[PDB]
Design an enzyme around this catalytic site. Structure first.
Site, PDB file in Angstrom:
ATOM      1  CE1 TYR A  33      -7.613   8.492  -7.523  1.00 43.73           C
ATOM      2  CE2 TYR A  33      -5.428   7.865  -8.005  1.00 43.73           C
ATOM      3  CZ  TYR A  33      -6.415   8.761  -8.192  1.00 43.73           C
ATOM      4  OH  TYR A  33      -6.083   9.903  -9.004  1.00 43.73           O
ATOM      5  CG  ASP A  59      -7.783  12.687  -9.320  1.00 44.56           C
ATOM      6  OD1 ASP A  59      -8.079  12.507 -10.453  1.00 44.56           O
ATOM      7  OD2 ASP A  59      -7.930  12.025  -8.346  1.00 44.56           O
ATOM      8  CG  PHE A  61      -4.021  11.882 -11.912  1.00 49.98           C
ATOM      9  CD1 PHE A  61      -4.125  13.235 -11.020  1.00 49.98           C
ATOM     10  CD2 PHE A  61      -3.032  11.608 -12.452  1.00 49.98           C
ATOM     11  CE1 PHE A  61      -2.977  13.873 -10.669  1.00 49.98           C
ATOM     12  CE2 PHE A  61      -1.790  12.247 -11.987  1.00 49.98           C
ATOM     13  CZ  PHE A  61      -1.753  13.230 -11.163  1.00 49.98           C
ATOM     14  CE1 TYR A  62      -5.694   7.379 -11.976  1.00 44.84           C
ATOM     15  CE2 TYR A  62      -7.032   5.520 -13.125  1.00 44.84           C
ATOM     16  CZ  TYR A  62      -5.681   6.143 -12.701  1.00 44.84           C
ATOM     17  OH  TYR A  62      -4.641   5.349 -12.705  1.00 44.84           O
ATOM     18  CB  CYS A  94      -2.767  11.319  -6.049  1.00 46.33           C
ATOM     19  SG  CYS A  94      -3.249  10.068  -7.226  1.00 46.33           S
ATOM     20  CB  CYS A 100      -0.705  10.155  -9.227  1.00 44.06           C
ATOM     21  SG  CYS A 100      -2.416  10.877  -8.941  1.00 44.06           S
TER      22      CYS A 100
END
EC number: 1.8.1.8
Length: 116
Positions: A33, A59, A61-62, A94, A100
């Site tokens: 990232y 994704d 996650f973010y 990740c 991740c």
């Protein structure tokens, strides 16, 4: 495919006086990232670090984030570094597989550099 973090993201550095190069070999199917990279000098002064332009990915996650695949090359300019100075490098990546790794921190020993 939960391989050790250091196998998915192989980190290394090379310094030649004022010039420092940070490299990450990124295994296929994994990514870093851009926004999770942090570089902090200790007892040294470095030029502003410009993170390179990566690719956009999505994704759970973010959501939409700028990521790096294959390899990340990051030049760093050391204007001054006293003896025993260090550079704290933190990053997070990740796996496309669906997980991740936690952020990882590496401490780079900086070779002394007299200013200007």
């Amino acid at each position: 495919q939960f391989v050790p973090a250091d196998q998915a993201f192989a980190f290394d550095f090379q310094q030649n006086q004022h010039d420092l190069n940070l490299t990450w070999q990124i295994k296929d199917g994994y990514y870093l990232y851009r926004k999770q990279i942090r570089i902090t000098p200790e007892h040294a002064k470095i030029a502003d670090v410009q993170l390179p332009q990566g690719v956009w990915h999505e994704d759970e996650f973010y959501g939409k984030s700028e990521i790096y695949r294959d390899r990340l090359t990051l030049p760093v300019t050391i204007n001054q570094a006293s003896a025993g100075a260090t550079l704290t490098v933190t990053y997070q990546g990740c796996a496309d597989a669906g997980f991740c790794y936690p952020p990882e921190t590496k401490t780079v020993p900086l070779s002394e550099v007299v200013a200007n």
